[PDB]
C-alpha cells in the first residue's frame, strides 16, 4: 500500500539533522493550521481509503499511468545515448502539477476545509488548483502577480471558467514570490476554513514531504517502465528543478539504486555570471525563505534577489529543502541550463519527435542531451517531460522569429 | 538573573501605566531621517523602540510598513544601518530592540549578530518568523550575549504552543492580533508573569488607553510610519498622544 | 469486415453511399493507397508499430471517467466521458494521423499533405510527420490562417510548411480542394493524409479503422466500471471520424443507442448552421456520395458554427448508411446549448472541453433527462478546449 | 450505332485538320453575354462547343476558369441556363456538348438531365469527376437518350484503367494534362482504340493548336477563351479565328 519513509524528515520537518534543511520558518499565528494539516496528512497518507480515492482520480480522471517514450530520433544529438521521456505532458491539464492538486484537494475535503487558496506564476498551478477545486466542489481563490495577470489574459479566463476567483497582487515585485506572500497572508487570516494548496515541494513542514509524496507516482511508474523497455535500471534520471516537485517525484523511486545518476537542471537564464538567472544551487546560498531552510538567491544582507528565466516555472529564487539535503549528501547533482540551451532543446524535440515540450521541461531535455554526450553510446537516460508546451508556443514562436513584426 | 527589559516594565507598573513600545523601520525615508525619527521617539515618550530591519519579503508586515520597507530597500538600506540606528538610540538615552525576519540574521551569522547588537547597546530581538522550534542557535546566542528574546503568540495559538512560546521568551511576549486581544493576554498571564505587549493597529490615544487596561505594553508601528510620512512634527504629536494613553494615573 | 464496403467503396448496396467520385488522374494513387492499406491492414509488423505508438507516444488507452457532478444536470443519468482530450496533441485526430503516416512511410512516399480548418488536423499531421521524418505541407484556409497564427506557428515549430489558401471562400472545404489539386500533381511522392472519415474509398473505411480503438476500449471500460453495456453512446459529428470511432464496437449491441450530435449554429431554422443530416441532402462531394449542405442546383452552401471542427458542409458516407439503416440517430445542437455545456463541464468536473465536444455533452444532458435516473451514457469527449478558451471567454464576457 | 460527334471528326479528317473544341462557362460574365459568346464561337469556326456548368467547388479547373464560374455563380447562374445555351448553340447550327461535375447532375436527375440535354440539341457529356466505375446510371441514360460519354484519361492512368475508360467512352476521349506527356497519352489510347482523342494543354496560340493537331483528333481550348472574353467579345472572335487556323496546319 503506502511506501516506507526511509528518506523522510524528522517530526520538525528537518532533513539531515534537527538543525538541517526544511523545518518551519513561519509565524506562530500559522502554527495551528500547519499542525492541523500535518496531522491530517499524517492520518490520510496511511489511509487505504484515501489512497484508493487518489488512485481512482489518477487513473480515470488524470489519465495515469503516463507512458515512457524512447525518443529514438534524439539519440544522434545526445552522443548516441538513449533518451526515455516520462510523458507527464500527457496528464490532464498538461503537467505533473495535477498530481499535487489532486492530493491536496482530497486532503482539504477530508479536513472539512471549504475554501482553497493557491499562488501561481504564469498560471500553471492556478489552473491546476482551480481544476481540482471544480472537480471537488471547493471554493477556489488564486493569487497571481499583477505583472503576470496583465500578461496572462487567457489563464485568468481559464481559472474563471473553472469557477475560481483571481486576485491581482500589486505589491512587491508583483510576480510569483509575491503571490506566495499574498496567499500566506490570506491563510493567516482565514485558517479556520481555508486550505493553502501549495504549488511545489517547498514551504514549511509538511509541505515538502506531502508534495513529494503526491509526485512519487512518477518515479514509481518510470522505474517499472524503464526496466520493461530497456531491460535494466537506467544510467541516469534527470529532470528540471524549479521548486523541485517534478524532480523529486521522479527521483525518489531511484534513491537507493546505487548505480543510477540523479541530475537536476535549473534555469540559468542569460547565464549564471550575468545575474539574470534562477540557478539557485549554482549561484545561491543556504538561507530561510518561504517557510523552509534551503538554498535561495540572496545578496550579502539576506535579501531576495529577483530571478529571471525564459520559462515561468523555473523563474523562482528558491528551491525545496529535500533537494538541498540530497545535494549536500551527494546523491544528486544540480547543473545549470541557459535560456538558449533550453530553446534549442525545445525546438529539437518539436522537429525530431513531434512533442512540443514545456520550456521548463526543455531545460531537462537540454541537460539530458549534454549528459548523453558525457555518458556515451548506449547510455539509458530517463527524462521527466514535466509538461506540454502549448502554453509556451507564443514565447517559442517569438524566439524563433515565427511571428515577425 | 533578570531580563534586559525587566526594569522598564517594573518602572511602568510602579507609575500605573503601560510601556509605550514604538516601531520604525531603518532607512525610511532614508537612513539619516529614520535615525532622526527614532531619536524623536525617545524624546517624545517611547519607553522601548522597535528598530525594524527592512526585509525584501516581509510576510507579516501590513501595507503601510511594507511600502515603507520597500522604499527603504530602494534607498539601499543595509543591515548594518540597523546596528547604527541602535547605537544612536542608546546614545540618545533610549532603549532599542530589533525586529527582524530571521534570514538577515542567518546571513549575518546568529552569534555574530547577537554580539554586534549587544555591543551596539541593543537589549533584545523580536523574531516574527522564528518560532521556538527553530530557535536553538538564537537561544544560545541570547544567553551568551544577554539579549531578550521576544517571541509572538496569536489568538489561534494552541494551549501547548502558547505555554512553550511564553516559556521560551524573555523581556516580554508579543501578543499580535473584537475581544481577541484581552483574551490572548489573559491566556499568557494564566501561565506566566512575563510582560505582555499588544499590537492592535493602534493609531490613537483612546486605543492605547484601552490596551493599557490589560497589557503591560502597547505596541505601535503602522501609525508611526504614517505619522513620519507626514513629517517629524506629526510623529512627535502622535507619540505624545500615545504616551498620554498608556498612562492610567 | 461485417460493416465494410464493397471493393468499390460503397456502403449499403443499391443506395451507393461512398464510392470514388474523383477524376481519373487520381485513380492510380487511390488504387495504390487502397492496395497498400489492405496489405498493411493484416501485417503484424504494421499493427505492432501502430500499437507501440498509440501506447507509448499517444498515451493510449484513454480513460473512461464517470462525471458524477454532471448527473444532476442530466436527469440523474450517469454520464461517462471517454477522455480523448487526454491524447497527445489533445484530440482523437492523433489516432488517424499515426495510422496514415505509418502507411505513407510503408508506401515509400516522402511527402505528406493535409488540410485543416482552425489547425487541429494540421497540427496532428505535422506531429506525426515530425515523428516519422516525413516532409509535411499543410493547406489552411486564408480566413483561418489570418486568425490562427499560433497554430501556424505550432506546425512550423514541428517542421511542416503551411500554405494559406486564397482560392474559393478561403475555408476548410477550400483547403481540401487545394490539397486535392496538390495530390493530383504530386501523387508520385505524396500521400494525402485526410482528416476525417469522408473522401473516396478507401478513406472513410481506413480512417474509421484507425479510430475504432476508441470504441473498443470504451466497450471494455464501460463493462468494467458499470458492469453492463451502456444505454447510449453519443458523439459529436463533423465529418464523422470521432463518432464512427466510438460507435463501431457497439454496432451489433442491439440495446445500445447511438446518437451523433451535429452543429446547429444559430439554429437550423436560420441558415447559419452545419447540420448536415438535419438540413442537408444526398449528393456527391469531396469524392464520396453522402449527405451535404447544398442548394437546389447541387452547389455547396456555406456552413456556420461557433465550433471550427464541426464547421464542414459534408459528412462521411458510413454515417449516411447508418442513418438510412436506422442504427444511429443524428440530432442538432445549437451554439448556445454547446456553450452552456462547455461552461457546465468546466465548473462541475474541471474539464475544459473542445467546443466540438461540448455539442456531445450538451446532447448527453438532453438524452439523460429523457432516459431517466441511472441510465448509462458514454460520451466521446473528442478534444480538450484549450484552443477554445478565448472563444468561450468572449461568449461568457470574461475579457476586459 | 455511330457516335453523335462521329460525323464531326469524320468531316475533320476528310479536310486534313483536327477539330477545334472550345469551352466556355454558362453565365460569365452573365447568362446573355455567355450565350452571345458561345454563338460567336460557332461563327468564328469552332467545331464543338463545351458548355460548362459552373460548379461551386471545381476541383479540376484552373484559376482562370474557376474565377469565371465563381463570377457566374455570384451572378445567379442556374443549371437550366446551361440547357438554354445548348439550345441556342444548336439553333445557330453549332454542335454543343456539356461539361459538368457530377453532383449538379445527381441533383437534377441523371436520366432527366440526359433527357433535357438531348431535347436541347446537346450531343454529349464530358464528366471530369465521374469515372466509369461510378457511371452505371450515366451509361444507361447515355444509351437511352443517344448522347456521347466523353470520359477522361490521364498520363498516370494504368493500362487496365485506360483501356476500360477508352472502352466506356463514346464520341471522343478527353486526354487531360494540365511536354511529351500529351502525345504519349494519345499514343496509348490509339494503341487500343480508334475513338477520336481530344487534348487540352492550355492552348493559347495558333502555333500551340497546330502542334497538337499533328497528333490529336481534336484541340481543346478553354482558359484562353475565357481570358479573351474578359477582354471583350471582339478579342474572343479574333483568338478563335487564329485557333481555327492552327488546326488546319
Ligand atoms: C505552503 C506554504 C506555507 C507558507 F506559510 C509559506 C510562506 C512562509 C512564510 C512567508 C513569509 C515569511 C513570514 N513571516 N517571510 C515571507 C516569505 F518567506 C510566506 C510564505 C509558503 F511559501 C508555502
Ligand atoms: C482523401 C481525399 C481525396 C480526395 F480526392 C478528395 C477530393 C475529391 C474530389 C475533389 C474535387 C472534385 C473533383 N474533381 N470536386 C472537388 C470538390 F469535391 C476534392 C477533394 C478529398 F476530399 C479527400
Short mmCIF file of C-alpha atoms and ligand atoms in Angstrom, two decimals, chain A residues 25-27 30 180-181 184 187 196 198 203-204 207 289-291, chain B residues 55 57-60 101 129, ligand 1:
data_model
loop_
_atom_site.label_atom_id
_atom_site.label_comp_id
_atom_site.label_asym_id
_atom_site.label_seq_id
_atom_site.Cartn_x
_atom_site.Cartn_y
_atom_site.Cartn_z
CA UNK A 25 10.18 29.24 9.43
CA UNK A 26 6.65 30.62 9.81
CA UNK A 27 4.91 32.92 12.29
CA UNK A 30 0.19 29.98 11.32
CA UNK A 180 3.08 33.40 -2.46
CA UNK A 181 3.40 36.15 0.16
CA UNK A 184 0.43 33.40 3.01
CA UNK A 187 -4.11 31.85 5.10
CA UNK A 196 -3.46 26.53 1.14
CA UNK A 198 0.98 24.93 -2.35
CA UNK A 203 7.49 25.67 2.16
CA UNK A 204 7.25 24.64 5.80
CA UNK A 207 4.57 20.59 2.50
CA UNK A 289 12.89 31.51 2.70
CA UNK A 290 9.18 30.79 2.22
CA UNK A 291 8.96 28.70 5.37
CA UNK B 55 13.25 42.74 4.51
CA UNK B 57 9.71 39.60 1.58
CA UNK B 58 8.01 40.72 4.83
CA UNK B 59 5.03 38.38 5.05
CA UNK B 60 3.82 39.62 8.43
CA UNK B 101 12.85 38.37 9.91
CA UNK B 129 9.09 34.36 11.66
C1 LIG E 1 2.72 26.07 1.96
C2 LIG E 1 3.42 27.36 2.31
C3 LIG E 1 3.13 27.96 3.52
C4 LIG E 1 3.76 29.14 3.86
F1 LIG E 1 3.47 29.71 5.04
C5 LIG E 1 4.70 29.73 3.02
C6 LIG E 1 5.29 31.02 3.48
C7 LIG E 1 6.00 31.15 4.67
C8 LIG E 1 6.47 32.41 5.05
C9 LIG E 1 6.22 33.54 4.26
C10 LIG E 1 6.67 34.89 4.70
C11 LIG E 1 7.60 34.82 5.88
C12 LIG E 1 6.99 35.39 7.08
N1 LIG E 1 6.53 35.82 8.04
N2 LIG E 1 8.53 35.74 5.18
C13 LIG E 1 7.70 35.69 3.94
C14 LIG E 1 8.46 35.00 2.82
F2 LIG E 1 9.17 33.93 3.27
C15 LIG E 1 5.46 33.40 3.10
C16 LIG E 1 5.00 32.15 2.72
C17 LIG E 1 4.98 29.14 1.80
F3 LIG E 1 5.88 29.69 0.98
C18 LIG E 1 4.35 27.94 1.45
#
